[PDB]
């Protein structure tokens, strides 16, 4: 069947360039045009342009003229897209697509290639355990927190008790501030089982080869 | 550039219900409109093309119509797997463009948020920072207002909010609000408050603490 396989994620600094691929299979490459689409964080979709495999002819969205360059290698049934003079505004997921039936545009999509542009330096997160207010809390259930601040790049893997607690967990999307990410996670436990039955926040950040544990302890 | 505007950013429905999403083109685009469905972590998927034709394999519950500037996308009977983001697109003009999307969500009984406030961790203060965190969890609907109050005065500067998508299990929403100040400034105020305003109550849910008071 028709398949479009895109290359892996890339992380570069402002001013750099990147070249990604889109390998077609399951059909005769030169039989259809290859379109490219950009989707930025908030899920905003924008058309970048298209290339005609047989001739290499290209059509671009005026907005991306000079920023993106489309090319093809008929030999390997692969389409490429190169971005230059990158800026944080170029960070997004880029898709390649092909039409179907007759006139059914964007019927087939690649899985997308994530591009992240930032001047930030790899920074391991500061992990802070958040115990309840010193005063007291009500009820038999209690919520605890974990603040993961000042890291780069994404992602981090946060777990509670090494993953043993998941049901009452809420891990929020990270927020970018001054080139660094921050996220928080809360866990709610029942039956007055804290602090009697220990709870620890674990955070792994592969980019910095770090893994830290922070036990939640009553404030004293 | 032709702008495609969708009827809503979010829509709530129930399994078995009939739902319709509309899109308006800023200019006549004849019937060169398509509708896509997208799930988290996945690529968009073509459902309707040329305004009214179902793409190969698309279930009969999906239909669309329109020509000119006003288009409709309809799900005759919503199924659980249909909760996702839907986008319209026009390809009559250049460049072709997409609407901003409409997220179809599941309706459930209203639920007040569970609010918890957290003073800065001792470890963070040693670095000169002071983040006060407030979690507002498992509420419905998504509409909510959080405001911070320091010694009775409302504070907006230094506050960052983060939201989770509707939970797949209990259909509720959760939010985290963080007020970040320096240790220097944090140590010059006594009472810290995070109050949440939600339709489930005319009165705000207030969580507070006084610095250094144990």
Numbering used by the authors:
A (entry chain H): 1 to 220
B (entry chain L): 1 to 214
Reproduce the article's own wording on this structure.
We have solved the 1.9 Å crystal structure of the Fab fragment of RAC18, a therapeutically important Ab with protective efficacy against the plant toxin ricin, an agent of bioterrorism concern. Ricin toxin, derived from the castor bean Ricinus communis, is a prototypic A-B toxin. RAC18, directed against the A chain, has the greatest neutralization activity, in vivo protection, and highest binding avidity. In this manuscript we compare results obtained using different Ab modeling tools with the actual X-ray crystallographic structure (1.9 Å) of the neutralizing anti-ricin mAb RAC18.
Among the 11 AAs, L96 is in CDR L3; the other 10 are part of the heavy chain. Heavy chain residues are Y32, Y33, and N35 in CDR H1; L50 in CDR H2, R99, L105; and F106 in CDR H3, and W47, A97, and R98 in the heavy chain framework. The shape of the pocket can be approximated as a half-ellipsoid with an estimated height of 8 Å, and major and minor axes of approximately 12 Å and 5 Å, respectively. There are 6 hydrophobic and 5 hydrophilic AAs in the pocket, and 2 hydrophilic AAs (R98 and R99) are charged. Although we have not identified the Ab combining site experimentally, it is a reasonable assumption that the pocket we describe, lined by residues from the CDRs, is likely to participate in binding to antigen. The pocket structure made by the RAC18 CDRs contains basic residues (R98 and R99) and is partially hydrophilic, and might support positive Q98 interactions. Although there is a great deal of similarity, this figure shows that dissimilarities in a small region of the CDR H3 loop account for much of the differences in the RMSD values calculated for the crystal vs. PIGS or WAM. (4) RosettaAntibody is the best at energy-minimization based loop modeling, especially the complicated CDR H3 modeling, because the H3 structure from RosettaAntibody has the smallest RMSD, highest TM-score, and lowest Z-score. PIGS has the best performance in predicting the 3D structure of the RAC18 Fab in terms of RMSD and TM-Score, and its overall performance in predicting the VL and VH regions measured by the Z-score is also the best, although differences are within experimental error and probably not significant.
